[PDB]
Design a protein around this ligand. Sequence first.
Ligand code: SF4
Ligand code: SF4
Ligand code: F3S
Ligand code: F3S
Ligand code: FES
Ligand code: FES
Ligand code: NI
Ligand code: NI
Lengths: 634, 634
Amino acid sequence: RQNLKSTDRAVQQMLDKAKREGIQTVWDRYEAMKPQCGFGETGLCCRHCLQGPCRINPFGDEPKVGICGATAEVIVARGLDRSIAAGAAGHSGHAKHLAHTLKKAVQGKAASYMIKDRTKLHSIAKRLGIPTEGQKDEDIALEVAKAALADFHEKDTPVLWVTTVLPPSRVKVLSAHGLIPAGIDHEIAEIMHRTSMGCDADAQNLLLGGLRCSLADLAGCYMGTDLADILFGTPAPVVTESNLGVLKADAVNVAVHGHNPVLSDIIVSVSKEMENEARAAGATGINVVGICCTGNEVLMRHGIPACTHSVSQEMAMITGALDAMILDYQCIQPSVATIAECTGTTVITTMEMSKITGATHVNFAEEAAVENAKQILRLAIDTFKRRKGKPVEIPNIKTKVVAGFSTEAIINALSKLNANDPLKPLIDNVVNGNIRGVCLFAGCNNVKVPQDQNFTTIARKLLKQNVLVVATGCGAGALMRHGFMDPANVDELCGDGLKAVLTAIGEANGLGGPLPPVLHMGSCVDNSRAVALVAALANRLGVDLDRLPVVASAAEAMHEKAVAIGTWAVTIGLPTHIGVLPPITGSLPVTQILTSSVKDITGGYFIVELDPETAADKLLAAINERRAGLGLPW
Amino acid sequence: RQNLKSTDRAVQQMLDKAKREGIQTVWDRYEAMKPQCGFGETGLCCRHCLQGPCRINPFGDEPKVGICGATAEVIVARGLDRSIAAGAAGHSGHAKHLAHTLKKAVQGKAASYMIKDRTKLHSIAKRLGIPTEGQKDEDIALEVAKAALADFHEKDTPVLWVTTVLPPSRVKVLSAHGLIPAGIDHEIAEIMHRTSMGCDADAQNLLLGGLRCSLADLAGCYMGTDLADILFGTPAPVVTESNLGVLKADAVNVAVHGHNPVLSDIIVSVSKEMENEARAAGATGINVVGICCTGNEVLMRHGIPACTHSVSQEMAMITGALDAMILDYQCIQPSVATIAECTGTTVITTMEMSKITGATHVNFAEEAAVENAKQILRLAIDTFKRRKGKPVEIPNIKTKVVAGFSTEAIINALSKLNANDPLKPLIDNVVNGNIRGVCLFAGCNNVKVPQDQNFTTIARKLLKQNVLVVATGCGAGALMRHGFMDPANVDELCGDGLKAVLTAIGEANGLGGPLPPVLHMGSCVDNSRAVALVAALANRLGVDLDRLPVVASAAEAMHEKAVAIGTWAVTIGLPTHIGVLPPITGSLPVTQILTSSVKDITGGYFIVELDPETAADKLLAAINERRAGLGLPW
Ligand code: SF4
Ligand code: SF4
Ligand code: F3S
Ligand code: F3S
Ligand code: FES
Ligand code: FES
Ligand code: NI
Ligand code: NI
């Protein structure tokens, strides 16, 4: 019964092939882990010193307290804080790498990289207060890169990738609670300090630190988007495909997998120059396909088709047609290195701090990006040759995907209805009820949840209630693989008011049809694009984000990064659903802070709800409560 | 049978009082935790994403691998790396606070602080390459503080508090393996990134990252010592007392507890100015006593007596005479806040990122240090008044302690035997066998080990074999409370060769007697002083640290900080004993790297040995192997 594992029928087909071939999958490794530890599930375990491990019984008798005296409240809050810091360390490490890449590019140390989006560069400079008039673009870019790197440590200003991206009234609320980060890596380190043994031991104090570190994560996300747009271009609407059927038996199939596209954007361009070298090997060409966020990056900017996402990533290899999987970091199941020996795929790591035993490593350096890409693609061509004559099983399943909805692209699309006040048509339709509110789907799949089931169940209910739905990361991946990015499905999926708006915008953009049911705003760092859009709406209305009918749903969350994103969504003022249990239920006081009393600090709050129908109802209630607070019908 | 809990007879007495009064202690909370989780004990548990908790059976059947495919090797190495980063975050956060304090002092923003050790300031400037000739001391200090803060982030130089404190040949070895940190908080964040889900998954690669982060911890330790010496004075030999008998029923007893003495050095000076205000309340005066590292700081600089350490910290409160416990951060059992309600003690937190529910918080700001100290001490005086007429039970147990052996003080003491080559007398006596080698005892007590039993058992065996023993932190605390810092015990404890050397040095310093059996080199950050001494010996000999007959023992380790210290001791080239099991035994490959194949990278290695007699034999074998490598008899 593969339907209990994944709602994706291409994934189901490959699960059947993996089973008859004896290849263990993530779902098999989950089954072998059951029953999982209830102390860990509830957050009532601590290993922060060598007197541990400590645990607390959720209910009953002793143990009731950690060996040092740490209560359930403290243990739960410390664990959560460390998860937030780990997420911030990933998103911001990605951003730091892009900042170094931009600096190298404009210093003449990496000519494969350049300022591709001069407009974005100048707008970021203006937002940061960096002078542009009279200055060479390379010098403006050097100053932007230096400002990015400066936000990682303490200085005479707070983190500008927080304070310059949210409205002043929001910054004021956060400043009053001490929540503005002083420096990105500074906050990460302070979390690790305060959560170490014999330090912070007050749940509220710990959680305030967590909120501040989540804003350091937001800064890293926004910095990542900004720098990637400068270097690689701001996305605009594009049409492509998704799911395993985008693989081609006749081609060299190369997946780019990870989050930082610094090399894989180069993989894309170099691959086109090697079509003839691939043809000499008997292929039709090189077919680059995306997995996870780096796949989203190249989908958004170049229309590279998305193969699969998150929990089902191993299934691309099970087809037998994946000649190479080119990795950088984050969200890569290390099982890919052993599965590759069964499937023939060449798995290649490229970043010094992210290696996998058994996978080939090819150092990637920006300074040698083209040469390193050719080395990598030649391993892929050799692999294609080795499968001459072997049957492959690529499920003939794919969907049409319209994507590329950066915030700039959304504003441009709206400007076709109102050129000099582009946000007003959107606001007008919120006011008149054609758009009930906005929901951002974000985050991962999680093996505990039948793959995509929460995203699609919740999205269907919200769309029928006229909610404008936007999506990023593997939430966008789930929705795209089930047809939610195909405008042909607007009639089936969308309420009449939402359909009218999507159609009015689409027709004004010359499409002869609507925008798609869900707007793909990009990778997980590109959750920052949704922040930009919401902050622009807030500023246009003269209100703060916690008055807007905007919610978020990390419906199948997995990674520490998703915990960090959900926490900053709460911190900036949003009702934020999470569809898997974070390790908090072992402390009622912590749960009550995160789901209730944080409303009094930031106006946002977590909605923890594992039943997707119920979660949809709770998200709609949150949207409608915001409508009522604005005096609007609902 | 309290002897199974602590070998300290004052602690035993208070354990009897706690038992009859029904006050739960750390030992009771340990007993209530048994049996502890074997997955956590062995390191075979991962909670790095919301698909967990994952575990691996040490032996038997499934589960054999994490849900994402993470092997035992990966899980163990990731957990260890996070512990190292957490330790680095503590030591370096302490250092960062001191750097900000020095900057404020010389900018005229905090006149309670000043350059007290101008000689240290100029020597640090010279070591860092900061110009002094022609410059005002305040400007040199501003440049030192700015250099300290710069080492937290990437810049055009590596972390100078690594590269300028180790000999060039050691820096070259470490650079060749990629182990020199780029920035302190940079490395902490990169650890949290690389150990997050779907990132680094190669044990060797992970552990190399851990070694590099441990050097970021060393940098924070050395920076902490350097800045504390500038601000508060470099220690020189001092005589005081230790153990609970240093409390006085007739006085206001105030413990300073934590690690950062930035306020407690101020507590010491302000307390003397309030003797009359205390006398008006019916006390004889204010009796400041030390717990843990901040107690070590004021013991080393001012001869403040040490009350207790680490695992037994609650027992100071059980006497009934502890009127206040003034806290900043790290190693404070949060149980003190609840015990205080039973004992009458006022527990006071002072740092924004380290609060304890139920404890009074008094913001400490350097800018208002004196006024904030008086507010704190007045709460203590009020508490003393409330116990007018209540009997107290202070065990009449204390030892004499000679301490204050900074590296400068050790060199000065040796210079009385050889004025212009002060290290030569020490080397001469290593060569002739009067000193077999050097052992640094470091780190915490741990409730799993009868308190002090490993430190004293190992130290006794090494001293009888003519090993020069130095100590820091709660290792120094254990040894001082058992008489190892009293020169009257040299005859009983020391081999004939070591006694001859300690006597020759002492007589040349005019003491009419020897140096004490063990040299107290200070707090845990002051493990950096031992590095300075060993590096000076290495440079004097023209060899690297991994050829010297010098070892370390974290004989009863507890905190993540102790894991970080042990790891940098290995990274700089030392055989390093740990007397409690770190969570590594679930992976034989990781254990073999840490205890064997790391020798081929850094020349150091861990010695994991829970039996103290066996550990002493293994440490002596390590020392003697180094002697043999130098061509010396042993
Ligand atoms: S920090 Fe406290 S609760 Fe955590 S493992 Fe150590 S003794 Fe146990
Ligand atoms: S990172 Fe891997 S091993 Fe760890 S909890 Fe997540 S699925 Fe399990
Ligand atoms: S790339 Fe990763 S953080 Fe989640 S959104 Fe996808 S599994
Ligand atoms: S102050 Fe703390 S780090 Fe260990 S050495 Fe003492 S318990
Ligand atoms: S007791 Fe299972 S997660 Fe620690
Ligand atoms: S299963 Fe006990 S430490 Fe996780
Ligand atoms: Ni993601
Ligand atoms: Ni310590």
